[model samples]
Target: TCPFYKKIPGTGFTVDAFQYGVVEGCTAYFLTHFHSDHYAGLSKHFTFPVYCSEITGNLLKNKLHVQEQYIHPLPLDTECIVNGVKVVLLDANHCPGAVMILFYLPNGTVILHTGDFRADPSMERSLLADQKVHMLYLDTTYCSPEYTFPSQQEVIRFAINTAFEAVTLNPHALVVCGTYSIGKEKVFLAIADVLGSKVGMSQEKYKTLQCLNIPEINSLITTDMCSSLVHLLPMMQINFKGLQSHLKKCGGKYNQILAFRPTGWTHSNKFTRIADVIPQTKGNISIYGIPYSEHSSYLEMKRFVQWLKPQKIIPTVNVGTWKSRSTMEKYFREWKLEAGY
Candidate 1:
């Protein structure tokens, strides 16, 4: 599992990671996102010219500290040749720089690696009707039937509205949200705009954003501790041990600490799971487990497979094939296979 980059059937190049260095062979590479799990075995010594988005390239320099000479920014929707194979990078809708790689193999095979992504209508529509995908490497984060999460847009609105209403009701309440190292910027930006406060983060996060050169997202900052209205703490800090102090009645500085965790695991029937919304009040902290995820839900994944109808399904993640591929395909037997036409 340390390395996910197994060479494609025909393509000499690889996806994700391949060992620690430039392989010492005549080969190339393609990266999907900045997630550590996906960027395994890649460090400063990665010598081959890597193909990815500009933000990813920037992060490669700033975060991973990879040499810029090896980092090639492949813009979205633009077709380019990498090691004699045609590739088009489409928005994965996962992280800021994530992409769903659409590859045109020299052997007349058209394949797609979903990377990590939620459902996107525009990308689906953009696929040419005549296009035929020989294989699909899916991001099977939520591969089970029980993982029937609601729409991402719906979840985001609920998280924002729920947090807004809660904060409005309690004047001195501190809303602490959970987020990853790179993704979930929208969550903070939306909550900040709606709550009329800056999203607080670690100084390191602020610096990473600076390196990314993203314009006009100063709505979130780490400058002043007192100014940090909605603290966007690291994903780890949103849990019991990290939040116990905030949940306890330690000081009169704040009335309450409302924690919002956006994930697909909110499908549990508990916590008022009506209409696919997990609005649960636990002890002092009201946890709104908003069912928002970068990867597609089971229903969404089914619809995607049925629509695209690739001859074969390959899960890009470490999740085994039994569940991600065979099990999923079993659930959708009447799956439609098309030439995308």
Candidate 2:
């Protein structure tokens, strides 16, 4: 729910609510990442003082072409005063520039806005871990029991191993990995590093990678399309029809098309081994949907909620619909009860 209402009630700060235009008493606009949904209303003409992490600020100027004068980049793990509220930015671990905002109100209320996050052990050292949080605006993207999947490392290794096996079977296969604009760089990058192969992508994706400042990414990307057997494509283009057309464009250079669509919806707790999660294949085109997500799994969310034990938990995503909200609230209640809060 990137375009959802994210206004922190009673505070002058609005987190990821650029889509709703300006609020009545809003003194500051805080962006969590460069995802279009999160920065929907932001544009070249947006003149408000927007605050976010340094990489997000760079992405705003480079990706969205926003002006530099209006961007305020807050360093990670450091506190700064914004509209009289002490604010700190922590790495959300959801994407390159995603952040979790911590707010200290003058009235002594602490609020944590998890813009988007993958719960990791590093978060245990956060300054907010020691504080009494009055409210928490959670991501709650995969807050259901059915959404649990393997860890990112395990998923990446699985994808790499699957790719190797597929390529070994079909040596002339054109391997394509689906990814978001800014997230999931680790998967394809690791594949390329392991295979010692360069990645082929559009110049726009290359420019976006340039903004990320990832070391040695320049050497891994190529301007020529067919020069590299491994390529990075948008997630929507990983379909069979899309791959067939792309293979046609390749002019028979490759024998088959092997695409990996990495997402959390593919795996389940019932599937214990890699063989349990199967890939779908047509004549010469195959699609493997792996459980590689940037969001927290259900177990991870439970751990995070139990760790924080905030007084009030607000669901950010899946909150627009009543049924979904009710379902999420049920999980929240059970998790809170388990936390003894």
Candidate 3:
């Protein structure tokens, strides 16, 4: 449950702009990030004027290929008032398009929605400096102690070390990493920094990366450039075979292939089996399983909720499950706050 707005009983406990409806009288629907869990219900159901950061808007339209009419892009720290509700976008620092939302109602009530945020001090500083959010919609996705993740820098270093090791052992190897279009840019940039050369990116990826203005990474590549060093880029499930064939044709001299499946690789046993097949050709194939998540930890979740101090908190995304809902409800109860639908 989120900590800001009261949940209407019949509508269900978890509610966001997309769940019930972003109706006419409503001020605006602010999207904190472009993650599937955060913006899943917006595709067909949401028709209201949406507010988000410019990068996030471009990410959805240019990167995700969503239509332009649906998004209203606003710069960070800028406020937009609609139907007496003031909304602002703050840097989330989890992903390129992620943000934290501040909603100031006409009645002087402020609501903050921390959509899938991490306990990043940098991100927190950005949020604190920009606005004093009264209510917080906390992200408790990784609240359990069992799911501890290494820092972004550490994860990138691990990937780079693994890639370099693979190249050193087997000179003729191709590394394919699986990441979402927005999040994978960091991985590609990290590899480029270590290898001291540009990575190969597809036309769509190149355009997306360019829009994000990432430094030290090159998207344009000639056949000569593609011939040398480790090429880090995302893989499409449909064109996996074609990519392998192309890489093989470019450098038939390499025998080892290393592919990193960063996301959607550990949902179930079936996914694990499918991941096993990604590196099945020629020389030894290595797949490194790293648990890299972008949500707040248990301690961070508690602090975020405390800071926001909303009247009520309603959990979403994982709201359908009994355990998740009950856990949130318990947390609210411990704080002497109400959590209800």
Q: Which candidate has the top score in lDDT?
A: 2
Q: List model 2 lDDT by residue over 181-217, tens digit each.
A: 6888878887777676898988888889888867777
TM-score for each prediction? 0.86, 0.93, 0.74
lDDT of all predictions: 0.72, 0.83, 0.58
Kindly report which residue stretches of model 1 are placed more than 4 angstroms away from their true locations once superposed.
1-5, 19-26, 127-130, 211-215, 244-252, 267-284, 318-326, 332-341
How far off is residue 162 in model 3, in Å?
2.2
Query: For candidate 3, what is the TM-score?
Result: 0.74
Error of 2 at 269 (Å): 5.8
Q: Which stretches of candidate 2 lie over 4 Å from their true place?
A: 1-5, 267-275
Error in Å for residue 194 of model 2: 1.6
Q: Give the lDDT of residue 314 in candidate 3.
A: 57
Can you tell me which runs of candidate 3 are displaced by over 4 Å? 1-27, 36-48, 63-70, 127-134, 216-228, 232-251, 264-283, 306-311, 332-341
- Give the range of the ten consecutive residues with the poorest summed lDDT in model 2: 266-275
Q: How many clashing pairs per prediction, in order?
A: 1, 0, 10
lDDT of 3 by residue, 1-341 (tens): 23234232222222245545444344456666666655655663345666677776877676555577878777786776644455667776577767776666666666666666676645546546555555556666665544444566666777788777777676667766565546645665566556655666456656666666454334533124365455544455314464555556655665655766665224342343322333333335555555455666565666556554556665644666799888777776665543221
